[PDB]
Amino acid sequence: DSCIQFTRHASDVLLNLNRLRSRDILTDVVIVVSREQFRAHKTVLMACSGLFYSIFTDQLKCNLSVINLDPEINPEGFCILLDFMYTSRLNLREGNIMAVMATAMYLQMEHVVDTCRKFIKAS
Amino acid sequence: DSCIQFTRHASDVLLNLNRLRSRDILTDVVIVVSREQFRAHKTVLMACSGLFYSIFTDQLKCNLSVINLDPEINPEGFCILLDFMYTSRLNLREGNIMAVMATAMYLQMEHVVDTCRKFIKAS
Amino acid sequence: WVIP
Amino acid sequence: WVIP
Ligand SMILES: CN(C)c1ncc(Cl)c(Nc2ccc3c(c2)CC(=O)N3)n1
Ligand SMILES: CN(C)c1ncc(Cl)c(Nc2ccc3c(c2)CC(=O)N3)n1
Ligand SMILES: [Cl-]
Ligand SMILES: [Cl-]
After folding, report:
1. Does the beta carbon of B90 sit less than 6 angstroms from any atom of ligand 1?
2. How large is the greatest C-alpha to C-alpha distance in chain C, in angstroms?
3. What does the PTM comment state (chains A, B)?
């Protein structure tokens, strides 16, 4: 086509979606990880995760307001990944890298799994 | 913070949200423009437009599944702007620039209004 | 704005 | 991935 493109549009959209999340505006699901609860937008979860994409395209699960993750999933690992989904920023540290990689493998977030493998290989 | 950043994350999120729109997955509103109907995600509309942000933060309007725009709004101008919201690409042409600028002013999409003003000033 |  |  003969379209023009606004370079910062995608980043600005994501910044606003994170602002809606922080104010709990139009969140339509709660993700339960052990005792911890995380509110989010189903569409953002699907856009970032192969696991949520599969869950919310399912004719029965698409209508659930509560999703319980596998008890092996660490709440801190999930929180770091949820923050990444809404910001593009990953808080990867020596003390959390194993929990982050395991959570990213479960959530099917290929690019996060790739950077965790590389950072582990270096150490 | 000491975060790392994935450069293509915001663009990849937007690409997936557009894939959900094209398949009509988790769309929660229909925007009526004259006789034409456009399905979309309320959160994406809010993230892109000052007008939709105001509408869907309103305690009564947040629950509406149908929104009727002002009869002066041109359906083609709206379609071009909706495509921009989901892609960052604007199909701006000599034959549509006046309808696009008027629709962007109504929708309160400041960056689109700015490029339309500049393109009109040049001609 | 750019030419993509 | 980059240092933002
Ligand atoms: C694959 N596909 C057509 C598609 N359409 C829409 C959405 Cl929201 C979607 N999201 C999704 C699927 C798989 C994966 C991801 C998002 C991230 C990832 O690493 N794998 N994937
Ligand atoms: C201003 N604010 C705190 C905010 N938070 C969340 C959202 Cl979704 C939002 N969106 C929005 C508001 C105004 C405008 C836009 C989006 C685009 C624009 O040109 N003006 N604005
Ligand atoms: Cl990823
Ligand atoms: Cl804009």
Report:
1. no
2. 9
3. Phosphorylated by ATM in response to genotoxic stress. Phosphorylation induces its degradation by ubiquitin/proteasome pathway.
Residues whose Cβ atom is located within 5 A of ion ligand 3: A 109, 111-112
User: How many domains does the structure of chain A reveal?
Assistant: 1
Q: Are A107 and A50 in contact (CB under 8 A)?
A: yes
The range of the structural domain enclosing residue A111 comes to 1-123
Closest ligand 2 atom, residue B109 Cα = 19
Q: List CB contacts (< 8 A) between A20 and chain B.
A: 43, 46-47
Residue numbers in D near A89 (CB within 8 A): 4
Instruction: Give the H/E segment covering residue B67.
Output: strand B66-68
Task: Provide the CATH number for the domain around residue B83.
Answer: 3.30.710.10
Locate A101 and state its tokens.
């990689």
- CB spacing of C2 vs A5 below 8 angstroms: yes
Tell me which chain B residue has its CA closest to the CA of residue A42: B26
A79-108: string of b/e by CB count within 10 Å (b at 16+)? bbbbbbbbbbbbbbeeebbebbbbbbebbe
Contact A95, A26 (CB under 8 A): no
Which technique was used to obtain these atomic coordinates? X-ray
Q: Rounded to the nearest whole angstrom, what is the distance from the C-alpha of residue B90 to the centroid of ligand 4?
A: 10
Question: In Å, how far are B24, B42, B46, B78 from B34, measured between CA atoms?
Answer: 21, 20, 21, 11
For residue B105, give the 3-state DSSP assignment. Answer: helix
Please check whether residue B42 is in contact with residue B52, taking contact to mean a CB–CB distance below 8 angstroms. yes
Resolution (A): 1.9
Q: Do chains B and D touch (3 or more CB pairs under 8 A)?
A: yes
